[PDB]
Write an enzyme that holds these catalytic residues in place. Structure first.
Site, mmCIF file in Angstrom:
data_model
loop_
_atom_site.group_PDB
_atom_site.id
_atom_site.type_symbol
_atom_site.label_atom_id
_atom_site.label_comp_id
_atom_site.label_asym_id
_atom_site.label_seq_id
_atom_site.Cartn_x
_atom_site.Cartn_y
_atom_site.Cartn_z
ATOM 1 N N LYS A 176 0.872 -1.166 0.000
ATOM 2 C CA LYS A 176 0.000 0.000 0.000
ATOM 3 C C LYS A 176 0.909 1.215 0.000
ATOM 4 O O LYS A 176 1.499 1.579 1.020
ATOM 5 C CB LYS A 176 -0.937 -0.033 1.196
ATOM 6 C CG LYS A 176 -1.846 1.147 1.283
ATOM 7 C CD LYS A 176 -2.711 1.031 2.498
ATOM 8 C CE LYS A 176 -3.392 2.352 2.768
ATOM 9 N NZ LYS A 176 -4.402 2.128 3.816
HETATM 10 C C1 KRN Z 1 -4.777 3.111 4.778
HETATM 11 C C2 KRN Z 1 -5.113 4.389 4.026
HETATM 12 C C3 KRN Z 1 -4.505 5.629 4.699
HETATM 13 O O1 KRN Z 1 -3.147 5.371 4.932
HETATM 14 C C4 KRN Z 1 -4.627 6.812 3.750
HETATM 15 C C5 KRN Z 1 -3.503 7.291 3.097
HETATM 16 C C6 KRN Z 1 -3.655 8.343 2.204
HETATM 17 C C7 KRN Z 1 -4.909 8.912 1.967
HETATM 18 C C8 KRN Z 1 -6.030 8.422 2.611
HETATM 19 C C9 KRN Z 1 -5.883 7.372 3.507
HETATM 20 O O2 KRN Z 1 -7.011 6.871 4.170
HETATM 21 C C10 KRN Z 1 -5.618 2.760 6.011
HETATM 22 O O3 KRN Z 1 -6.066 3.623 6.828
HETATM 23 O O4 KRN Z 1 -5.832 1.540 6.214
#
Ligand code: KRN
Ligand code: KRN
Ligand code: KRN
Ligand code: KRN
Lengths: 324, 324, 322, 322
Positions: A176
């Site tokens: 990710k």
């Molecule tokens: C992963 C997603 C977050 O790390 C994130 C990163 C960038 C933009 C928006 C978001 O929600 C998670 O929370 O599992």
């Protein structure tokens, strides 16, 4: 059940929340997971054509769920999926033994891998982080591992030589990934990892390297997944035809829909309220019911909440626009 | 057992490690606490005249112990102390429900309070942090709470209005405090908290406000507690006599002994290796056996290790110098 | 004869560079109100200040033209009449410019330069040490006050830096910020009078009353009676051993500063350091700081309000302690 | 007629300010090797560069004297003979100085100024926007290239800043760093040619081949054959749709840069930006960058070695692609 590789990771990989009951912000409550909504969401994502499901990252509240809550949530997800799509649970914790213990248990229930950041009470350096993921993959070699490369949450910044080391670990199949400034180099250093850009960066990333960049992660899909499905289908048509016009229009739409998500455009300020902002966006969009945040992270400044609800309304509209 | 207040917090408060067995760096090991050394240390600190014991902070490995390890460690500490000095356990965790569950259990075993930072997967803001400590003190009102005000470990920076809010919580009786640049103001904003400067800052802090600054925390005491006892006795003689000459000489000695502890003088670089550097210093000094670090935090650059061992040798010598 | 640390005592006040009403316009060319300069100096000395620093951050060393600087110092030099020591400021973007500026302003009659470091490129420790040794060796009749602001100058002025500066005779003093390492720094730098911020002088004097005999003040531009009273009261406290009245004055000064920093944040305050100080001074009514020279003439209104409230609090304190 | 973004194509190379062998000495007064300046320009044009930028960070805009700057531009202006566009650099500590410098150097015959922002005080967004509007309005015949380096200039050049700069006709281009938000920025700033770093041009050209037609290069000071080959090969790739050879050239350039950043860290590299670039160039042997003007003449040896290894790698690449 034969273990996942990077070749099995394509398309729209959507991160779902952990639905909460109406009293979940109260520390006195103990069974705060709405398993009915949990199941319902899984059915509607799979029906919408998602290629895979991630869960239990920051906004999925891996930090604030209890262990019994996590087991009931994973169990419900696994049953409802019925092996129709791959599923990653999340097992970041404060040390390697707890990570291993959780990963073992949740893999046994039926998740196919773990979305995994690093312990963050003490900021990890590069050898510490490499050995952490090595220890985990050696201790549970049947688990696929998605690196949750979040430097705000996890302090460690997942630099280029880290990615070269992860490509050496068979279990590490995907990541990710956040900003793509160094994606070109990271693909070269890490041939065996399917790098998932953020959905808004998928357009640019796939243009950089259409061979390697075939999948992305989405939280916007929790407001209506048609937009992510449309982007997936149109980018892959674009790779063949060479006409990226429609893919750029979707992607520009997604960017504009996120334009109010981060307080002041600031990822670090957004990161203080990651859980609440994602859930409020989702609450506002009405495609699913994310619900209140488990403690301590149940306080979001109203100005910030408004930005998230506007984003949620923008994504619901994009879902309508790209549906059918 | 009537609950601790700030008036009961004076003198040398020494932070002990969680002794580990020779295989404790291995994630496969499960009972890595050396309860014999744990007990032996408690006996020798109390015999040396320490006024109180803290534990289970960063270098005490609150992050990396297992729950069964923590219960056996606290149990052994409690028995060995036999109510002769107050004892604080440590129960920082990733959410408010786990903090509460741990605190309840360890208070029931016999600890008198908890040394408590804040959940740090998501960086906490000021209202989030205040409500966290309010929730905990309301859920376990018989527990005394020592704020572990470490911005490196816990992201949140514990600013001035936070301290004004903690003074309103009866359970919050003391604080493990770092730099004293704003100690003058924090004492005014927080009349009901016994602020513990670091042992090296105790000299200056007690000169600022000898009425309020009567206690300090020490990790150098794990290399030989005579120096901390000598400093305590000499500062309080200095407050009465007005002759601070001997107190300054001890304090300058302590500062010089720490001169190699932080890599490059850098608290943030030290913080990446907090556990290993403190334990190696302690290993090197030979007053107790801290032992290997539980995973993932068992890798320290050799240059950094040398600085810690030099500090450990410097403190052992200070112990000899200030003994008898 | 050049200053030493033994000459640096009591209240040292930092002067703005007062600006004519067109001073925000980049077309303007001579924007120093030399008559307000002269009048501030007269009023500062009459009030009993021990010395005058100037031309730091809010003194607009960065946004004044050279001729504007020449005329400013001349006005100050000749209004002082040798009654108190005076430090100008000559921080610039390289050593040769710093030297060329220090020569001319010392020649005009400044006693020293309050000096930070070139900050286009952040310096490490050896770079900064050599820079100061270069200037001191190049203008040895000039005293040096280290302007140790890591927000402006990037470099953080760590402990080994203070040990080196004690090796340089010209470095007599230091405009100092947080006091968390002051005890150690006083040990590493025996030849430097450390000036805490005025709000921090109470605590610092108590730590080391032999060494901590002076402080720097910008609130004195709102009315210097509070700083003068804190100097006299702290001096009496060091003899009587009774610090109640010094703590009362000090606690008043902190309260008056409590709305200065936007959100309590030093780094957010540093973005509007010029504007917030001069807007505070303008609102106090002791002097007319005037508009900020470009480019730093834009400040959010909420922040401006906070500084004006502080200007009113300090001006109230000046009446309280006259 | 003044440049627009449509004039900004291909390889744009950033020139050092070559220094005479006494240039580290603060006593020195005329430290530009004007004959090496002239000779670099001749060799750059002969090699086929599209335009010449200069006087940024490693170009020592911060540490040159004014007369040294005047003579440098004159030498460049008259060696170019109008064959390519030329940007000088005039970043200084305030708007009035930036304006006064831009006037004279444009008058000497520069086409534009590569410009960051005053950085003694960190600017917010409205401060920075007004600064650029001030300069553009004050020297409208000058093109502007935003030098968007948050390490040097503190301000981070966010998305709303790029939208504003597209409102200014004079801002034709931008020396740009990480490309993580380039897709968005190209959308917000239609009138700006964004120059990625040479190592990032491959990926950026693939994102938006219509807009990404140019890049900036400092490795070309080690031998410009690699940058020229990457321009020609990327242009062919946009037509054939075959990017294998462009990716081969790009991957070689990253490898040659892999020891430039001390510990891979951009912020640690920024502390020695001047020294490491000029030491890399000196070791390549294509030109003689020379000693660094004070105060930035001190660089740790381990770091110096890393830059010399990179200079050797780029010089090898120049032979590979001649
Ligand atoms: C992963 C997603 C977050 O790390 C994130 C990163 C960038 C933009 C928006 C978001 O929600 C998670 O929370 O599992
Ligand atoms: C607390 C002590 C650490 O936070 C610390 C802080 C400053 C200097 C040295 C040390 O160990 C703990 O680890 O429990
Ligand atoms: C020095 C004073 C500033 O650096 C400063 C620091 C802290 C509070 C207030 C002020 O003005 C100067 O401006 O020359
Ligand atoms: C601009 C170039 C520097 O900002 C820079 C940035 C990244 C890598 C290398 C270099 O030199 C300039 O020095 O004018």
């Amino acid at each position: 059940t034969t273990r996942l590789t990077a070749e099995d990771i394509n398309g729209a990989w959507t991160i779902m929340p952990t639905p909460s009951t109406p009293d979940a912000s109260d520390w006195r409550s103990t069974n705060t997971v709405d398993l009915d909504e949990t199941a319902r969401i899984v059915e509607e994502l799979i029906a919408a054509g998602v290629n895979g499901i991630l869960s239990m990252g920051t906004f999925g509240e891996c930090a604030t769920l209890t262990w019994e809550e996590k087991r009931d949530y994973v169990s419900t997800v696994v049953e409802t999926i019925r092996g129709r799509v791959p599923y990653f649970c999340g097992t970041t914790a404060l040390n390697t033994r707890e990570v291993i213990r959780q990963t073992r248990e949740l893999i046994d229930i039926g998740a196919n891998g773990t979305m995994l950041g690093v312990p963050m009470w003490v900021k990890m350096d590069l050898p510490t982080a490499v050995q952490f993921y090595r220890d985990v993959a050696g201790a549970v070699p049947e688990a696929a591992i998605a690196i949750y490369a979040n430097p705000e949450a996890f302090k460690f910044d997942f630099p280029r030589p880290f990615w070269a080391e992860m490509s050496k670990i068979p279990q590490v199949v995907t990541a990710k990934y956040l900003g793509i400034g160094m994606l070109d180099l990271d693909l070269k250093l890490a041939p065996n990892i399917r790098f998932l850009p953020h959905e808004d960066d998928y357009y640019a990333a796939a243009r950089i390297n259409p061979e390697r960049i075939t999948a992305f992660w989405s939280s916007g899909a929790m407001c209506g997944p048609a937009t992510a499905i449309m982007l997936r289908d149109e980018v892959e048509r674009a790779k063949s035809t060479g006409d990226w016009i429609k893919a750029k229009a979707i992607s520009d739409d997604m960017r504009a829909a996120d334009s109010t998500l981060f307080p002041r455009g600031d990822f670090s300020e957004f990161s203080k309220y990651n859980i609440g902002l994602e859930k409020a966006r989702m609450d506002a969009a009405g495609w699913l019911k994310a619900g209140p945040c488990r403690p301590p992270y149940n306080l979001v400044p109203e100005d910030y909440l408004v930005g998230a609800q506007k984003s949620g309304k923008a994504w619901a509209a994009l879902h309508a626009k790209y549906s059918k």
